[PDB]
Amino acid sequence: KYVDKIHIGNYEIDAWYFSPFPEDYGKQPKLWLCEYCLKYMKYEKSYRFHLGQCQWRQPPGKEIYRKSNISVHEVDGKDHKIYCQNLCLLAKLFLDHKTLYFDVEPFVFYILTEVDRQGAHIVGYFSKEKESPDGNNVSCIMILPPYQRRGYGRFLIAFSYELSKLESTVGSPEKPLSDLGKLSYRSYWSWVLLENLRDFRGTLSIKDLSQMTSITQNDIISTLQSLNMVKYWKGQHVICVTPKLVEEHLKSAQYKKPPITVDSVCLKWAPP
Ligand SMILES: O=C(NNS(=O)(=O)c1ccc2ccccc2c1)c1ccccc1F
Ligand SMILES: [Zn+2]
Are the beta carbons of 171 and 135 closer than 8 angstroms?
yes
Nearest to 70 by CA among 198, 196, 159, 169: 159
**CATH class label, 185-251:** mainly alpha
CA of 192 to the centre of ligand 1 (A): 14
- Does ligand 1 have an atom closer than 6 angstroms to the CB of 191? yes
Question: What Rg, from alpha-carbon coordinates, does the chain have?
Answer: 20
Query: Which residues, at least 6 apart from 254, have a Cβ–Cβ distance to it below 8 Å?
Result: 187, 190
Which residue has the least CA distance to atom 4 on ligand 1?
149
Catalytic residue among 12, 74, 129, 174: 174
CB 137 within 8 A of CB 164: yes
**Resolution value, angstrom units:** 1.7
Q: Which residue from 184, 191, 226, 254 has its CB within 8 A of the most atoms of ligand 1, so it is best to mutate?
A: 184
Report helix angle 217-226 to 206-213, nearest 10.
110
The amino acid at 70: I
Q: What's the CA gap between 223 and 239, in Å, rounded? A: 11
| Residue-wise burial string across 36-50, b where 16 or more C-beta atoms lie within 10 A, e elsewhere | bbbbbbbeeeebeeb
Q: Residue by residue, what is the 3-state secondary structure of the chain?
A: CCCCEEEECCEEEECCCCCCCCHHHHCCCCEEECCCCCCEECCHHHHHHHHHHCCCCCCCCEEEEEECCEEEEEEECCCCHHHHHHHHHHHHCCCCCCCCCCCCCCEEEEEEEEEECCEEEEEEEEEEECCCCCCEEECCEEECHHHCCCCHHHHHHHHHHHHHHHCCCCEEECCCCCHHHHHHHHHHHHHHHHHHHHHCCCCCCHHHHHHHHCECHHHHHHHHHHCCCEEEECCEEEECCCHHHHHHHHCCHHHCCCCCCCCHHHECCCCC
Residue 157 and residue 173: Cα distance in Å, rounded? Answer: 9
Residue 220 near residue 196, CB atoms below 8 Å: no
Give the separation between CA 202 and CA 213, rounded to whole angstroms. 16
CA-190 nearest atom, ligand 1 = 13
Question: How was it solved?
Answer: X-ray
Peptide linkage before 176 cis (omega within 30 of 0): yes
The atom number, within ligand 1, closest to the CA of 157 reads 24
Contact 65, 17 (CB under 8 A): no
CA distance 160 to 172: 9
Show Cβ contacts of residue 244 under 8 Å, excluding neighbours closer than 6 positions.
none
Please report how many Cα atoms fall inside a 13 Å half-sphere around the Cα of residue 85, on the Cβ side. 13
- How do strand 136-138 and strand 119-129 relate by DSSP bridges? unpaired
CA distance 129 to 171: 12
177 CB under 6 A from ligand 1?
no
| 162 part of the active site | no
Q: How far is the CA of 133 from the CAs of 144, 172, 260, in angstroms?
A: 29, 12, 31
CA dist., res. 269 & res. 272, Å (int): 8
**Cα–Cα distance between 73 and 259 in angstroms, integer?**
20
Ligand 2 centroid to Cα of residue 26, in Å, is 20
